[PDB]
């Protein structure tokens, strides 16, 4: 076992377990779905729907009805270190929608000289207004020649600090100041069919990286199978054995509108404002397989291989309206012919462009096809004097018994009637 | 796919910083933040000490009476913390996507 594949193995089990270690705290503090509501994991719940039978919403209020059944003289003192001091009320309000920082308001009362090595009166100057706007009211003590705050008002309008004498530390930008207030499983890893590591579960069923306390093994197995799908788990009773194995066929993609992938910057997200995508319909359960109708994956052009926007998918359907390189090839191939004249090559390329612009396989439709040609390029041949070789080509196709001769008479008479 | 080194290195660095600041894997046992108290202030009648915690100001300056030694190191679950201030540990825990 050289160090190269060992470190590769280490990184390959470091990145998904790092992602899961982040997702551990994420789903603990911000869960995605309640684990109690899972069918294979319901032992975590510890109640039933009995109380819903006897409940009555209108009788709730009486229950909470039975649940409902100052001169702040802040006196300073001599500091303990090795000056003047000022008191201030710091009102911290609630977070509004428009603002991201909390509202803070520092009302300084007044300064006073105090020794080292006065008082301030407040006759009911809380100014909270009882409007559900004062989240907290702290008392800051500014000094000079060390500043710090302390939570005075609690959440429920309760008092935190006691009355009488007291002391508190401080921090500029031991030293303090004084004042006087007064109102068993075992994972068996496997990479390239090699027993790289063998361990034993410390706890009985506490997940190793998710850390949920499930009192059943089948629920743990289904959780390891469904969640954390980068690995593959197999279990056989043989003390318990668990066979971890990388899934090298993951479905890693955007899992959404993928047209934002190929924006100008790398992997943009058009969250601000709307954006168009193609329609889809995914259905996974109806009465407990999958079934996905429509299209939800990005596309690319045929010849250019650039990204295809969702707005133009049905409109301007590529691979129709046959390309120009075939036209240029038909031009240069007959131009390469030596013993052919100029006007003959001209009417040859005109007939090639005509039959390519409108495909004709039916024989009888050829009787109409010449009638389109004078109706499509007649004005061109008068601009080049190709009527004689055009009639020669008409007689040439007539030699193969494709058209009748009175149709050719009608065609040339119609062509020469408009020419005059 | 969709997980490059650009996001992975930042996730690893922030997770290492959070583990150093909280000691989740070492002391927390994977599911507990371990806070440490500090001598913030005191007030004497009956004594009462106000203590500020170590890692950040997410928790309040808690008052206590003469279990001061028991509160030297307090473990607490993540969900038990207040929802209104549990985001300062790592700001990509939850963030509003459109921002406006």
């Amino acid at each position: 076992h050289v160090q190269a594949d060992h470190e590769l193995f280490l990184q390959a089990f470091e990145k998904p377990t790092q992602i899961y270690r982040f997702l551990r705290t994420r789903n603990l503090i911000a869960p995605i779905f309640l684990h109690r509501t899972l069918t294979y994991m319901s032992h975590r719940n510890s109640r039933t729907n009995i109380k819903r039978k006897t409940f009555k919403v209108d009788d709730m209020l009486s229950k909470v009805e039975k649940m409902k059944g100052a001169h702040l003289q802040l006196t300073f003192t001599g500091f303990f270190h090795k000056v003047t001091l000022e008191v201030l009320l710091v009102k911290v309000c609630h977070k509004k929608r428009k603002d991201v920082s909390c509202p803070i308001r520092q009302v300084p009362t007044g300064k006073k000289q105090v020794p080292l090595n006065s008082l301030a009166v407040s006759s009911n100057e809380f100014e909270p207004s009882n409007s559900h706007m004062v989240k907290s009211y702290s008392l800051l003590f500014r000094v000079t020649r060390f500043v710090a705050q302390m939570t005075v008002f609690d959440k429920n309008r309760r008092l935190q600090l006691l009355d009488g004498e007291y002391e508190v530390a401080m921090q500029e930008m031991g030293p303090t100041l004084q004042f006087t207030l007064r109102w068993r499983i075992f994972y068996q890893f496997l990479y390239n069919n090699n027993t790289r590591q063998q361990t034993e579960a410390r706890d009985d069923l506490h997940c190793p990286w998710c850390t949920l306390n499930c009192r059943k093994l089948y629920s743990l197995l289904k959780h390891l199978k469904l969640c954390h799908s980068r690995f593959i788990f197999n279990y056989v009773y043989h003390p318990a054995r668990i066979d971890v194995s990388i899934n090298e066929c993951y479905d890693g993609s955007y899992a959404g509108n993928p047209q934002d992938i190929h924006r100008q910057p790398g992997f943009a997200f058009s969250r601000n404002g709307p954006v168009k995508r193609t329609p889809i319909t995914h259905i996974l359960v109806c009465r407990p397989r999958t079934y996905s109708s429509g299209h939800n994956r990005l596309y690319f052009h045929s010849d250019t291989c650039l990204p295809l926007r969702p707005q133009e998918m049905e409109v301007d359907s590529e691979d129709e309206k046959d390309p120009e390189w075939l036209r240029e090839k038909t031009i240069t191939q007959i131009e390469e012919f030596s013993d052919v004249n100029e006007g003959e090559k001209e009417v040859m390329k005109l007939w090639n462009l005509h039959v390519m612009k409108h495909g004709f396989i039916a024989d009888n439709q050829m009787n109409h096809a010449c009638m389109l040609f004078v109706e499509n390029y007649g004005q061109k041949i008068i601009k080049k004097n190709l009527c004689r070789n055009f009639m020669l080509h008409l007689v040439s196709m007539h030699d193969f018994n494709l058209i009748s001769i009175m149709s050719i008479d009608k065609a040339v008479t119609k062509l020469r009637e408009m020419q005059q | 796919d969709f997980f490059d080194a650009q996001t992975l290195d930042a996730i690893r660095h922030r997770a290492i910083c959070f583990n150093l600041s909280a000691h989740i894997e070492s002391l927390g046992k994977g599911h507990s933040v371990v806070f440490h108290s500090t001598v913030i202030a005191k007030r004497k009648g009956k004594i009462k000490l106000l203590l500020h915690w170590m890692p950040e100001d997410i928790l309040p300056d808690v008052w206590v009476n003469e279990e001061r030694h028991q509160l030297k190191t307090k473990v607490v679950h993540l969900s038990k913390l207040p929802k209104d201030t549990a985001l300062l540990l790592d700001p990509n825990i939850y963030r509003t996507m459109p921002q406006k």
């Binding site: 089990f13 270690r21 590591q197 361990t199 579960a201 | 894997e25 070492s26």
Partner: peptide, 23 residues
């Protein structure tokens, strides 16, 4: 075996970063 499950991940999560997780 003697190396437990959680011990490996903690060393593994750090991936040599200086988290000082007992190893």
């Amino acid at each position: 075996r003697k190396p437990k499950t959680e011990d490996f991940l903690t060393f593994l999560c750090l991936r040599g970063s200086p988290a000082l997780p007992n190893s």
